[PDB]
From Swiss-Prot:
Protein name, per record: Small ribosomal subunit protein eS6A
Family: Belongs to the eukaryotic ribosomal protein eS6 family.
Location within or outside the cell: Cytoplasm; Nucleus, Nucleolus
Anything else known: Present with 66000 molecules/cell in log phase SD medium.
Residues of the full protein shown: 117 to 174 of 236
Quaternary structure (record): Component of the small ribosomal subunit (SSU). Mature yeast ribosomes consist of a small (40S) and a large (60S) subunit. The 40S small subunit contains 1 molecule of ribosomal RNA (18S rRNA) and 33 different proteins (encoded by 57 genes). The large 60S subunit contains 3 rRNA molecules (25S, 5.8S and 5S rRNA) and 46 different proteins (encoded by 81 genes). Interacts with snoRNA U3. uS11 interacts with MPP10. Component of the ribosomal small subunit (SSU) processome composed of at least 40 protein subunits and snoRNA U3.
UniProt function note: Component of the ribosome, a large ribonucleoprotein complex responsible for the synthesis of proteins in the cell. The small ribosomal subunit (SSU) binds messenger RNAs (mRNAs) and translates the encoded message by selecting cognate aminoacyl-transfer RNA (tRNA) molecules. The large subunit (LSU) contains the ribosomal catalytic site termed the peptidyl transferase center (PTC), which catalyzes the formation of peptide bonds, thereby polymerizing the amino acids delivered by tRNAs into a polypeptide chain.
Residues recorded with modification Phosphothreonine: T47
Cross-link named Glycyl lysine isopeptide (Lys-Gly) (interchain with G-Cter in ubiquitin), sites: K15, K33
Source organism of this protein record: Saccharomyces cerevisiae (strain ATCC 204508 / S288c) (Baker's yeast)
Taxonomic path: Eukaryota, Fungi, Dikarya, Ascomycota, Saccharomycotina
Highest taxon in the source lineage: Eukaryota
Length: 58
RNA sequence: AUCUGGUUGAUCCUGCCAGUAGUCAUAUGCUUGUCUCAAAGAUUAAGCCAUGCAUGUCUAAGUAUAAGCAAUUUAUACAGUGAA
């Protein structure tokens, strides 16, 4: 409507997982046919102590 | 491959009732030191049941971004192990 809601209209929770199938990635970026996809994959970083690692899907 | 006691004052018979041994055949009574081997809720009620267990499973080789761990390092797709 017109007014705002304190917990329901203000925040934005981000999604948990990007795409995995190769054609299903090119849909998400709108890339063309002749483009390599394996340089266009979302990566997630995680660190315990001082070890910055990288999770990335197969 | 065997027989003995009992009918009459006495004797020969027909005849059955005691006796006598066996049982991987069950209980029961009094006793009971050793080695080996061992059945065991069938009979009566295929009656009733407290609690716990008895069916789950992975290799180099179907699916891992665990906000798992190991970090260890050639590896920017992923590659070690590995819950759900």
């Amino acid at each position: 409507g017109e007014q705002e809601l304190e917990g329901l209209t203000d925040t934005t929770v981000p999604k948990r997982l990007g795409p995995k199938r190769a054609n299903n990635i090119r849909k998400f970026f709108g890339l063309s046919k002749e483009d390599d996809v394996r340089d266009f994959v979302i990566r997630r970083e995680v660190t315990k102590g001082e070890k910055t690692y990288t999770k990335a899907p197969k």
